[PDB]
Structures are given as structure tokens and as C-alpha cells.
Design a protein around this ligand. Sequence first.
Ligand SMILES: COc1ccc2nc(C)c(O[C@@H]3C[C@H]4C(=O)N[C@]5(C(=O)NS(=O)(=O)C6(C)CC6)C[C@H]5/C=C\CCCCC[C@H](NC(=O)O[C@@H]5CCC[C@H]5F)C(=O)N4C3)nc2c1
Ligand SMILES: [Zn+2]
Length: 197
Amino acid sequence: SHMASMKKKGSVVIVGRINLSGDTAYAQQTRGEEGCQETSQTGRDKNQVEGEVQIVSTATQTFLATSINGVLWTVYHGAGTRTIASPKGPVTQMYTNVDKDLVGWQAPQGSRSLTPCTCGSSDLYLVTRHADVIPVRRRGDSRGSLLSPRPISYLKGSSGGPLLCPAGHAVGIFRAAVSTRGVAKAVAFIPVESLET
Ligand SMILES: COc1ccc2nc(C)c(O[C@@H]3C[C@H]4C(=O)N[C@]5(C(=O)NS(=O)(=O)C6(C)CC6)C[C@H]5/C=C\CCCCC[C@H](NC(=O)O[C@@H]5CCC[C@H]5F)C(=O)N4C3)nc2c1
Ligand SMILES: [Zn+2]
């Protein structure tokens, strides 16, 4: 049967975190590939969630997700409409806006949220999936220039991650990057003003 064969997409799965709790940022893995794949099909994740910045994966892609205002946020171009695995099964998005490249699920129990920035700073810090902290000078409301131009491979797979102000508040989450000749020159982010409700 055609219809009896039709499968459902898996869930997004938290497979790690970027620990920002001390004086040193570092990535932690909390689930390997096989467990990720199994957890994606069942949607049941018994792992204890911690921190603000999660490493997340689908069957095919991996990226980041950041908790702000009690919502775990990430990019639509990573997560699409997918549910997220939780200790109680798959959890449906409570926010979806493809026009902002944004989705959100209720923050997992045990997680913490970052504080939205109110400083109006232009000195930003992008945290990557590799726990690199990359100085960015803000350009207007939703863009930023890299102070230090690195290869664009350094930024691949960090969408959903936070841009932070000097005090560690969330200014937005990383959405896109602009390069020239393969060197990253600027970034676009979803302002924290939209990361609420
Ligand atoms: C499908 O529904 C939608 C809805 C809205 C929507 N909105 C945007 C902007 C969009 O873009 C897509 C995905 C996004 C991306 O790659 N995001 C990053 C990442 O890391 N992704 S990822 O985590 O690897 C991944 C893929 C999730 C797992 C962080 C970069 C890092 C490196 C980029 C490498 C080369 C790619 C350069 C692109 N450049 C660019 O578009 O610049 C724009 C154009 C001019 C201004 C500027 F904003 C770019 O950055 N893109 C291309 N797709 C969609 C799709
Ligand atoms: Zn701030």
C-alpha cells in the first residue's frame, strides 16, 4: 500500500550544548549519531537538558537552538515545521514564522533562558557550534560585520546560535552569513525583539 508506506518526518533532537556557564565556552556532546537517529523517530528524549544554547540535529542537518523568554528558538531553514523530542514525546512548535526564518518550542524543562539585551550595543559576540566566540560589529538592527575574517566553514552549522552583547545578553540568533571568495564578511541575525511569545 502506498499510503500505508508513507512515513512521518522525525523530530529535532538535542545532541549537545554550548556551555557558557563559566569563564570558558565549550561544546559538549550528549547524544551520538545512532541515539540521535532513534530519538528522532520516536520523539522521546529522556536526557536531562541543561543550559541556554543547545546543539540540535535532524536526520540530515545539525545546527543550534537558543533559549530566550522561555522558548527554545532556532531557524526555520534548519528545523522546518518539525516537532522536538522531549521526555514526554514529540513536542509541537509553539511559534513558526518562515518569513523571519524562525521557529520556537516551549523551552525544555531544566533549561535556562538568556536575557534579551537592552544595551543597544554595537559590539556583539557570535557563539558558534564549536564554542568559538566571534566578535561582530553590529550594522543596524539585524546585521553585523566580522571584525576578524575567517573561512565560511567556521560558521556553517551555527544558525540558531546566539549573538551576545558584552554583558552576555542575547541580541538575536544567527540566521545567515555573507562571504566573498569563501571568507566570511558579515552575518544576519533575528533580533531578540522578535524572540518572544
Ligand atoms: C526553507 O525555509 C526558509 C525560510 C527563511 C530562510 N532565510 C535565509 C536567509 C536562508 O538562507 C539559507 C540558509 C542560510 C544559512 O546557511 N545559515 C547559516 C548556517 O549555518 N546554516 S546551517 O546551520 O548550516 C543549516 C543549513 C541549518 C542546518 C549560518 C550560516 C553559515 C554559513 C553560510 C554558508 C553559505 C550559505 C550562505 C547564505 N547566505 C545568505 O542567505 O545571506 C543573506 C542574503 C543576503 C543577506 C543575508 F542575510 C545563508 O547564510 N543561508 C542560505 N534560507 C531560508 C529557508
Ligand atoms: Zn546587553
